[PDB]
mmCIF file of C-alpha atoms and ligand atoms in Angstrom:
data_model
loop_
_atom_site.group_PDB
_atom_site.id
_atom_site.type_symbol
_atom_site.label_atom_id
_atom_site.label_comp_id
_atom_site.label_asym_id
_atom_site.label_seq_id
_atom_site.Cartn_x
_atom_site.Cartn_y
_atom_site.Cartn_z
ATOM 1 C CA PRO A 1 18.952 30.162 -95.550
ATOM 2 C CA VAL A 2 20.627 34.366 -95.164
ATOM 3 C CA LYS A 3 23.986 34.217 -96.963
ATOM 4 C CA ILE A 4 26.070 37.316 -95.616
ATOM 5 C CA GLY A 5 29.986 38.206 -96.379
ATOM 6 C CA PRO A 6 32.613 36.984 -96.845
ATOM 7 C CA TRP A 7 35.244 38.778 -94.470
ATOM 8 C CA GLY A 8 38.848 38.553 -95.831
ATOM 9 C CA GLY A 9 41.146 39.020 -98.788
ATOM 10 C CA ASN A 10 40.503 38.526 -102.237
ATOM 11 C CA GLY A 11 43.045 35.629 -103.174
ATOM 12 C CA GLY A 12 42.806 32.156 -103.046
ATOM 13 C CA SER A 13 39.865 30.616 -104.697
ATOM 14 C CA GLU A 14 36.091 30.860 -104.553
ATOM 15 C CA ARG A 15 34.414 27.909 -102.330
ATOM 16 C CA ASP A 16 30.709 27.361 -101.570
ATOM 17 C CA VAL A 17 28.517 24.633 -101.278
ATOM 18 C CA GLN A 18 25.481 23.253 -103.500
ATOM 19 C CA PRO A 19 22.922 23.011 -102.034
ATOM 20 C CA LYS A 20 22.884 25.494 -99.365
ATOM 21 C CA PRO A 21 22.447 24.577 -95.980
ATOM 22 C CA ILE A 22 19.708 24.851 -93.861
ATOM 23 C CA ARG A 23 21.151 23.461 -90.658
ATOM 24 C CA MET A 24 24.991 22.497 -89.591
ATOM 25 C CA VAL A 25 25.820 19.207 -88.358
ATOM 26 C CA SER A 26 29.453 19.422 -87.993
ATOM 27 C CA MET A 27 32.347 21.986 -88.627
ATOM 28 C CA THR A 28 36.385 21.471 -88.749
ATOM 29 C CA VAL A 29 38.973 23.812 -88.785
ATOM 30 C CA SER A 30 42.286 23.734 -89.594
ATOM 31 C CA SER A 31 44.695 26.391 -87.813
ATOM 32 C CA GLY A 32 48.079 27.144 -86.827
ATOM 33 C CA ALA A 33 49.342 30.484 -86.659
ATOM 34 C CA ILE A 34 46.227 31.677 -89.038
ATOM 35 C CA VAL A 35 43.319 29.581 -89.718
ATOM 36 C CA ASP A 36 44.406 27.520 -92.919
ATOM 37 C CA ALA A 37 41.294 25.641 -94.106
ATOM 38 C CA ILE A 38 37.610 25.150 -93.137
ATOM 39 C CA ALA A 39 35.419 21.984 -94.085
ATOM 40 C CA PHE A 40 31.913 21.243 -92.699
ATOM 41 C CA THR A 41 28.672 18.875 -92.642
ATOM 42 C CA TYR A 42 25.184 20.236 -93.349
ATOM 43 C CA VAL A 43 21.765 19.345 -94.111
ATOM 44 C CA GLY A 44 20.811 21.036 -97.250
ATOM 45 C CA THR A 45 17.688 22.761 -98.532
ATOM 46 C CA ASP A 46 17.068 19.208 -100.233
ATOM 47 C CA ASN A 47 16.618 18.074 -96.764
ATOM 48 C CA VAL A 48 19.902 15.253 -97.330
ATOM 49 C CA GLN A 49 23.058 15.429 -95.422
ATOM 50 C CA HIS A 50 25.860 16.552 -97.288
ATOM 51 C CA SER A 51 29.488 16.864 -97.171
ATOM 52 C CA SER A 52 30.816 20.601 -98.052
ATOM 53 C CA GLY A 53 33.629 18.187 -99.876
ATOM 54 C CA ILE A 54 37.750 18.119 -98.976
ATOM 55 C CA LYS A 55 38.295 21.187 -97.012
ATOM 56 C CA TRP A 56 38.901 24.535 -98.108
ATOM 57 C CA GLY A 57 42.464 25.650 -97.660
ATOM 58 C CA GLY A 58 45.825 24.045 -97.440
ATOM 59 C CA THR A 59 47.640 21.067 -95.951
ATOM 60 C CA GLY A 60 49.103 23.321 -92.932
ATOM 61 C CA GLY A 61 47.617 23.519 -89.557
ATOM 62 C CA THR A 62 45.818 20.992 -87.097
ATOM 63 C CA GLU A 63 42.172 20.177 -87.419
ATOM 64 C CA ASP A 64 39.692 20.799 -84.785
ATOM 65 C CA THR A 65 36.121 19.530 -85.040
ATOM 66 C CA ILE A 66 32.951 20.753 -83.397
ATOM 67 C CA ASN A 67 29.821 18.880 -83.365
ATOM 68 C CA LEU A 68 26.346 20.424 -83.389
ATOM 69 C CA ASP A 69 22.786 19.638 -82.830
ATOM 70 C CA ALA A 70 19.415 21.023 -81.792
ATOM 71 C CA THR A 71 20.767 22.391 -78.273
ATOM 72 C CA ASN A 72 24.369 22.949 -79.250
ATOM 73 C CA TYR A 73 24.462 25.367 -82.260
ATOM 74 C CA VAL A 74 26.989 27.980 -83.212
ATOM 75 C CA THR A 75 25.404 31.625 -82.141
ATOM 76 C CA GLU A 76 28.600 33.917 -82.688
ATOM 77 C CA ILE A 77 31.690 33.842 -84.889
ATOM 78 C CA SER A 78 34.274 36.674 -84.789
ATOM 79 C CA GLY A 79 37.632 36.522 -86.401
ATOM 80 C CA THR A 80 40.491 39.179 -87.951
ATOM 81 C CA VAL A 81 41.742 40.000 -91.575
ATOM 82 C CA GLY A 82 45.148 40.443 -91.559
ATOM 83 C CA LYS A 83 48.465 39.733 -93.049
ATOM 84 C CA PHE A 84 50.181 36.425 -93.319
ATOM 85 C CA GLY A 85 52.871 36.545 -95.263
ATOM 86 C CA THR A 86 51.841 38.975 -98.428
ATOM 87 C CA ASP A 87 48.248 37.986 -98.404
ATOM 88 C CA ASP A 88 45.016 39.568 -96.397
ATOM 89 C CA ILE A 89 43.760 36.304 -94.702
ATOM 90 C CA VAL A 90 41.512 35.114 -91.802
ATOM 91 C CA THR A 91 44.145 35.069 -89.245
ATOM 92 C CA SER A 92 42.034 34.391 -86.283
ATOM 93 C CA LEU A 93 38.478 33.134 -85.920
ATOM 94 C CA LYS A 94 35.936 32.359 -82.499
ATOM 95 C CA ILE A 95 33.343 30.181 -82.363
ATOM 96 C CA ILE A 96 30.795 30.697 -79.918
ATOM 97 C CA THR A 97 27.720 27.704 -79.153
ATOM 98 C CA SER A 98 24.679 28.033 -77.388
ATOM 99 C CA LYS A 99 26.052 26.069 -74.715
ATOM 100 C CA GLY A 100 28.560 28.981 -73.941
ATOM 101 C CA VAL A 101 31.518 27.325 -75.225
ATOM 102 C CA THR A 102 34.348 29.378 -76.944
ATOM 103 C CA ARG A 103 36.866 28.087 -79.716
ATOM 104 C CA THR A 104 39.365 30.031 -80.877
ATOM 105 C CA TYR A 105 41.656 29.234 -83.982
ATOM 106 C CA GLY A 106 44.885 31.089 -84.986
ATOM 107 C CA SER A 107 46.646 33.574 -83.134
ATOM 108 C CA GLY A 108 46.881 36.329 -85.774
ATOM 109 C CA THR A 109 45.664 40.091 -85.733
ATOM 110 C CA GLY A 110 44.396 42.606 -87.911
ATOM 111 C CA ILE A 111 40.799 44.044 -88.726
ATOM 112 C CA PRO A 112 38.281 42.721 -86.318
ATOM 113 C CA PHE A 113 34.774 41.343 -87.817
ATOM 114 C CA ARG A 114 32.083 39.838 -85.522
ATOM 115 C CA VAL A 115 28.608 38.538 -86.419
ATOM 116 C CA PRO A 116 26.709 37.830 -83.041
ATOM 117 C CA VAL A 117 23.452 36.140 -83.780
ATOM 118 C CA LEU A 118 20.493 36.881 -81.450
ATOM 119 C CA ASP A 119 17.020 35.372 -80.545
ATOM 120 C CA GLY A 120 18.025 31.425 -81.397
ATOM 121 C CA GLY A 121 19.293 31.848 -85.050
ATOM 122 C CA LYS A 122 22.516 29.840 -85.960
ATOM 123 C CA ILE A 123 25.014 29.565 -88.208
ATOM 124 C CA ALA A 124 24.014 27.379 -90.716
ATOM 125 C CA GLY A 125 27.485 26.888 -92.937
ATOM 126 C CA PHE A 126 30.266 28.851 -94.939
ATOM 127 C CA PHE A 127 31.289 30.144 -98.224
ATOM 128 C CA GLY A 128 34.392 32.234 -99.029
ATOM 129 C CA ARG A 129 37.984 32.180 -100.338
ATOM 130 C CA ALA A 130 40.675 29.801 -99.883
ATOM 131 C CA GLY A 131 44.179 28.854 -101.495
ATOM 132 C CA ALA A 132 47.088 27.583 -98.700
ATOM 133 C CA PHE A 133 45.139 29.439 -96.316
ATOM 134 C CA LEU A 134 41.727 30.865 -95.620
ATOM 135 C CA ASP A 135 41.612 33.732 -97.449
ATOM 136 C CA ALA A 136 37.926 34.860 -96.706
ATOM 137 C CA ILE A 137 34.697 33.521 -94.529
ATOM 138 C CA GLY A 138 31.309 34.063 -95.088
ATOM 139 C CA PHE A 139 28.010 32.747 -93.515
ATOM 140 C CA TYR A 140 24.680 31.206 -94.254
ATOM 141 C CA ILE A 141 22.499 32.009 -91.085
ATOM 142 C CA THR A 142 18.688 30.541 -90.430
ATOM 143 C CA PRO A 143 16.546 32.467 -87.888
ATOM 144 C CA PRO B 1 13.828 37.485 -90.027
ATOM 145 C CA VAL B 2 17.948 36.708 -88.802
ATOM 146 C CA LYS B 3 18.955 39.356 -86.107
ATOM 147 C CA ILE B 4 22.759 39.908 -85.625
ATOM 148 C CA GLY B 5 24.564 42.738 -84.240
ATOM 149 C CA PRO B 6 25.129 45.239 -82.872
ATOM 150 C CA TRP B 7 27.824 46.989 -83.747
ATOM 151 C CA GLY B 8 29.210 50.206 -82.214
ATOM 152 C CA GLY B 9 29.583 51.337 -78.421
ATOM 153 C CA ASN B 10 28.310 50.039 -74.903
ATOM 154 C CA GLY B 11 26.806 53.845 -74.257
ATOM 155 C CA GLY B 12 23.254 55.352 -75.106
ATOM 156 C CA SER B 13 19.912 53.425 -74.291
ATOM 157 C CA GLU B 14 18.914 50.130 -75.959
ATOM 158 C CA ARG B 15 16.537 50.300 -79.032
ATOM 159 C CA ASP B 16 14.487 47.802 -80.578
ATOM 160 C CA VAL B 17 11.056 47.388 -82.742
ATOM 161 C CA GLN B 18 8.055 45.299 -81.616
ATOM 162 C CA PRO B 19 6.783 43.568 -83.852
ATOM 163 C CA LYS B 20 9.961 42.338 -85.185
ATOM 164 C CA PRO B 21 10.031 43.502 -88.961
ATOM 165 C CA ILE B 22 9.717 41.675 -92.279
ATOM 166 C CA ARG B 23 10.303 44.277 -95.189
ATOM 167 C CA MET B 24 11.703 47.500 -94.763
ATOM 168 C CA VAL B 25 9.421 50.473 -96.372
ATOM 169 C CA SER B 26 11.669 53.341 -95.558
ATOM 170 C CA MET B 27 14.563 54.546 -93.486
ATOM 171 C CA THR B 28 16.003 57.879 -92.302
ATOM 172 C CA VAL B 29 19.548 58.718 -91.096
ATOM 173 C CA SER B 30 20.148 61.726 -89.249
ATOM 174 C CA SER B 31 23.792 62.576 -89.529
ATOM 175 C CA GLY B 32 26.651 65.064 -89.491
ATOM 176 C CA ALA B 33 29.760 64.811 -88.829
ATOM 177 C CA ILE B 34 28.979 61.226 -87.374
ATOM 178 C CA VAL B 35 25.519 59.384 -87.249
ATOM 179 C CA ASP B 36 23.280 61.056 -84.917
ATOM 180 C CA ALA B 37 20.013 59.201 -85.175
ATOM 181 C CA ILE B 38 18.077 56.460 -87.078
ATOM 182 C CA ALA B 39 14.258 55.818 -87.958
ATOM 183 C CA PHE B 40 12.520 53.683 -90.211
ATOM 184 C CA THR B 41 9.442 52.196 -91.415
ATOM 185 C CA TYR B 42 8.325 48.521 -91.852
ATOM 186 C CA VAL B 43 6.100 45.440 -92.072
ATOM 187 C CA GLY B 44 5.857 43.496 -88.877
ATOM 188 C CA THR B 45 5.573 39.876 -88.523
ATOM 189 C CA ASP B 46 1.516 40.950 -87.850
ATOM 190 C CA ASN B 47 1.637 41.611 -91.342
ATOM 191 C CA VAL B 48 0.654 45.441 -90.605
ATOM 192 C CA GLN B 49 2.824 48.386 -91.331
ATOM 193 C CA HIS B 50 4.322 50.325 -88.531
ATOM 194 C CA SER B 51 6.727 53.040 -87.191
ATOM 195 C CA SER B 52 9.511 52.095 -85.657
ATOM 196 C CA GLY B 53 8.597 55.522 -83.280
ATOM 197 C CA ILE B 54 10.337 58.529 -82.575
ATOM 198 C CA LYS B 55 14.070 58.710 -84.191
ATOM 199 C CA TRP B 56 16.946 56.667 -81.903
ATOM 200 C CA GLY B 57 19.376 59.308 -81.170
ATOM 201 C CA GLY B 58 20.033 63.246 -80.575
ATOM 202 C CA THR B 59 18.397 66.280 -82.519
ATOM 203 C CA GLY B 60 21.573 66.817 -84.640
ATOM 204 C CA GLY B 61 22.613 66.123 -87.741
ATOM 205 C CA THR B 62 20.150 66.513 -91.045
ATOM 206 C CA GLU B 63 17.883 63.858 -91.942
ATOM 207 C CA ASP B 64 17.616 61.951 -95.095
ATOM 208 C CA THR B 65 15.227 59.468 -96.841
ATOM 209 C CA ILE B 66 15.563 56.156 -98.674
ATOM 210 C CA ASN B 67 12.391 54.837 -99.853
ATOM 211 C CA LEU B 68 12.067 51.068 -100.468
ATOM 212 C CA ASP B 69 9.862 48.626 -102.759
ATOM 213 C CA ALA B 70 10.033 45.347 -104.521
ATOM 214 C CA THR B 71 12.960 46.448 -106.899
ATOM 215 C CA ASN B 72 14.644 48.799 -104.633
ATOM 216 C CA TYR B 73 15.848 47.263 -101.178
ATOM 217 C CA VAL B 74 19.077 47.588 -98.835
ATOM 218 C CA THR B 75 21.509 45.011 -99.852
ATOM 219 C CA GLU B 76 24.777 46.085 -98.195
ATOM 220 C CA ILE B 77 25.415 48.450 -94.971
ATOM 221 C CA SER B 78 28.821 49.132 -93.886
ATOM 222 C CA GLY B 79 30.170 51.601 -91.480
ATOM 223 C CA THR B 80 32.988 52.529 -88.868
ATOM 224 C CA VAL B 81 32.741 52.575 -85.013
ATOM 225 C CA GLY B 82 34.948 55.058 -83.465
ATOM 226 C CA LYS B 83 35.619 58.000 -80.999
ATOM 227 C CA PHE B 84 33.283 61.044 -81.124
ATOM 228 C CA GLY B 85 34.196 63.024 -77.901
ATOM 229 C CA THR B 86 34.315 60.246 -75.348
ATOM 230 C CA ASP B 87 32.031 57.444 -76.619
ATOM 231 C CA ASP B 88 32.688 54.718 -79.281
ATOM 232 C CA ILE B 89 29.868 55.388 -81.907
ATOM 233 C CA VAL B 90 28.974 54.653 -85.334
ATOM 234 C CA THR B 91 30.870 57.327 -87.174
ATOM 235 C CA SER B 92 29.783 56.719 -90.611
ATOM 236 C CA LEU B 93 27.381 54.551 -92.403
ATOM 237 C CA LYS B 94 27.204 53.678 -96.139
ATOM 238 C CA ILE B 95 23.931 52.094 -97.444
ATOM 239 C CA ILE B 96 24.007 50.223 -100.823
ATOM 240 C CA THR B 97 20.825 49.269 -102.917
ATOM 241 C CA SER B 98 19.555 46.765 -105.203
ATOM 242 C CA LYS B 99 19.670 49.617 -107.638
ATOM 243 C CA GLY B 100 23.336 50.152 -107.259
ATOM 244 C CA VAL B 101 22.941 53.346 -105.320
ATOM 245 C CA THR B 102 25.340 54.260 -102.472
ATOM 246 C CA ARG B 103 24.368 56.831 -99.646
ATOM 247 C CA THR B 104 26.977 58.031 -97.029
ATOM 248 C CA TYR B 105 26.239 59.187 -93.567
ATOM 249 C CA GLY B 106 28.758 60.610 -91.427
ATOM 250 C CA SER B 107 32.240 61.537 -92.452
ATOM 251 C CA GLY B 108 34.089 59.820 -89.430
ATOM 252 C CA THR B 109 36.617 56.890 -88.926
ATOM 253 C CA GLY B 110 37.552 53.586 -86.483
ATOM 254 C CA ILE B 111 37.173 50.088 -86.914
ATOM 255 C CA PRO B 112 35.137 49.145 -89.821
ATOM 256 C CA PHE B 113 32.127 46.936 -90.109
ATOM 257 C CA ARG B 114 30.740 45.513 -93.522
ATOM 258 C CA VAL B 115 27.561 43.278 -93.683
ATOM 259 C CA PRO B 116 26.646 42.224 -97.711
ATOM 260 C CA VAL B 117 23.515 40.605 -98.306
ATOM 261 C CA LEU B 118 23.780 38.236 -101.266
ATOM 262 C CA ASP B 119 21.235 36.045 -103.324
ATOM 263 C CA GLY B 120 18.531 38.400 -102.927
ATOM 264 C CA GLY B 121 18.495 38.947 -99.369
ATOM 265 C CA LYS B 122 17.796 42.485 -97.947
ATOM 266 C CA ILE B 123 17.902 44.418 -94.624
ATOM 267 C CA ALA B 124 14.383 44.634 -93.257
ATOM 268 C CA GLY B 125 14.932 46.857 -90.194
ATOM 269 C CA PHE B 126 17.632 47.663 -87.252
ATOM 270 C CA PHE B 127 17.890 47.460 -83.705
ATOM 271 C CA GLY B 128 20.708 49.037 -81.365
ATOM 272 C CA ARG B 129 21.636 51.841 -78.974
ATOM 273 C CA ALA B 130 21.430 55.741 -79.003
ATOM 274 C CA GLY B 131 21.779 58.555 -76.768
ATOM 275 C CA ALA B 132 22.791 61.783 -78.108
ATOM 276 C CA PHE B 133 24.009 59.970 -81.029
ATOM 277 C CA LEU B 134 23.880 56.146 -82.900
ATOM 278 C CA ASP B 135 26.096 54.244 -80.232
ATOM 279 C CA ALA B 136 25.342 50.869 -82.160
ATOM 280 C CA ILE B 137 23.386 49.331 -85.195
ATOM 281 C CA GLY B 138 22.239 46.054 -85.437
ATOM 282 C CA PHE B 139 20.203 44.187 -88.729
ATOM 283 C CA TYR B 140 17.170 42.278 -89.054
ATOM 284 C CA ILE B 141 17.689 40.377 -92.335
ATOM 285 C CA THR B 142 15.591 38.159 -94.504
ATOM 286 C CA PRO B 143 16.666 35.863 -97.322
HETATM 287 C C1 MMA C 201 53.763 29.476 -89.153
HETATM 288 O O1 MMA C 201 53.583 27.972 -89.293
HETATM 289 C C2 MMA C 201 52.157 27.348 -88.373
HETATM 290 O O2 MMA C 201 50.897 28.206 -88.825
HETATM 291 C C3 MMA C 201 50.597 27.770 -90.299
HETATM 292 C C4 MMA C 201 49.732 28.860 -90.547
HETATM 293 O O3 MMA C 201 48.469 28.650 -89.637
HETATM 294 C C5 MMA C 201 50.555 26.512 -90.384
HETATM 295 O O4 MMA C 201 50.230 26.130 -91.761
HETATM 296 C C6 MMA C 201 51.719 25.391 -90.016
HETATM 297 O O5 MMA C 201 51.656 24.266 -90.143
HETATM 298 C C7 MMA C 201 52.187 25.799 -88.486
HETATM 299 O O6 MMA C 201 51.120 25.380 -87.753
HETATM 300 C C1 MMA C 202 50.333 30.979 -101.591
HETATM 301 O O1 MMA C 202 49.389 31.804 -102.409
HETATM 302 C C2 MMA C 202 48.397 30.696 -102.357
HETATM 303 O O2 MMA C 202 47.501 30.865 -101.099
HETATM 304 C C3 MMA C 202 47.220 32.382 -100.656
HETATM 305 C C4 MMA C 202 46.551 32.191 -99.535
HETATM 306 O O3 MMA C 202 45.442 31.486 -99.065
HETATM 307 C C5 MMA C 202 46.282 32.673 -102.010
HETATM 308 O O4 MMA C 202 46.114 34.055 -101.746
HETATM 309 C C6 MMA C 202 46.992 32.955 -103.136
HETATM 310 O O5 MMA C 202 46.051 32.897 -104.082
HETATM 311 C C7 MMA C 202 47.260 31.254 -103.140
HETATM 312 O O6 MMA C 202 45.857 30.545 -103.689
HETATM 313 C C1 MMA C 203 29.934 68.338 -85.445
HETATM 314 O O1 MMA C 203 28.741 68.792 -85.584
HETATM 315 C C2 MMA C 203 27.953 68.316 -86.181
HETATM 316 O O2 MMA C 203 27.990 66.783 -86.208
HETATM 317 C C3 MMA C 203 27.430 66.769 -85.182
HETATM 318 C C4 MMA C 203 27.436 65.141 -85.228
HETATM 319 O O3 MMA C 203 26.686 64.268 -86.123
HETATM 320 C C5 MMA C 203 25.834 66.869 -85.315
HETATM 321 O O4 MMA C 203 25.220 66.360 -84.252
HETATM 322 C C6 MMA C 203 25.961 68.531 -85.560
HETATM 323 O O5 MMA C 203 24.331 68.877 -85.819
HETATM 324 C C7 MMA C 203 26.602 68.908 -86.614
HETATM 325 O O6 MMA C 203 26.370 68.526 -88.046
HETATM 326 C C1 MMA C 204 26.160 62.920 -74.599
HETATM 327 O O1 MMA C 204 26.081 61.437 -73.881
HETATM 328 C C2 MMA C 204 24.774 60.755 -74.456
HETATM 329 O O2 MMA C 204 24.985 60.441 -75.639
HETATM 330 C C3 MMA C 204 26.163 59.647 -75.940
HETATM 331 C C4 MMA C 204 26.301 59.100 -77.424
HETATM 332 O O3 MMA C 204 25.129 58.752 -77.930
HETATM 333 C C5 MMA C 204 25.829 58.066 -75.237
HETATM 334 O O4 MMA C 204 26.935 57.270 -75.039
HETATM 335 C C6 MMA C 204 25.449 58.532 -73.727
HETATM 336 O O5 MMA C 204 25.010 57.499 -72.894
HETATM 337 C C7 MMA C 204 24.604 59.512 -73.517
HETATM 338 O O6 MMA C 204 22.984 58.829 -73.960
#
């Protein structure tokens, strides 16, 4: 995959997956006022299915899961980076799939970021930073 | 390549290349107060070298060319989208290469965008919108 990002603040602890993802199977976002945590399931470059492990971020918010397949894949993610308390974090995220559904996580504000993937490309997974919340998010993308 | 973006306003006319780029050979940005135009040279998916054609945007600004090769490639582009007159355009662009040189085009402000490419990935080319100026910029990226 291509690896781009992340978007967000410098706090929390680094997060990534080994091996790198080639296809995302599911993703789970934990959120409330802002984005608390993220987790996902993927097929790696080893052609095996993996978990990203325990979620990246705290125990706050509520979980929501998106299940992906050959015709239902993530084509756009956008969001905002702003304060929640003293830290710059991911204060909102919006996920758009190839079947035209939008999910929105968080209700926060700040500086917008947007990654529209065109021509059949798709988000294959995530990396970033997280502590109590999701400080920063980055993407693995396949054409 | 992966195709992502664009970042900018809805004005000007659509711009793209056929065939799609797999490797960027050079890029030329025209700029003054803001970004006036962009052009580049690339190797296509047809494994031939191509021009992007006449520049995308107006006759304003001054040209600056970056020449790329196997060890000197674009690893990050950032910029801002803001007003110049009545239109939202690309008011600044910053290009960073694998040899650690930064070029900055434009002196404008507005909403920032940033695409850091990690792990040896690189910008392979551009698409977007342009009229008198560079209304919007998007990127082709290879891992
Ligand atoms: C403000 O409190 C709410 O938002 C935070 C941040 O999203 C969550 O951790 C918490 O559980 C609540 O839902
Ligand atoms: C509450 O502090 C923790 O959480 C914030 C937000 O995630 C991080 O910035 C910080 O480094 C800690 O990990
Ligand atoms: C404000 O005028 C300057 O900036 C504009 C926009 O970049 C250019 O077109 C022009 O030639 C000048 O350099
Ligand atoms: C001056 O008007 C032209 O240039 C601006 C800026 O590029 C475009 O938005 C617009 O559509 C026209 O093409």
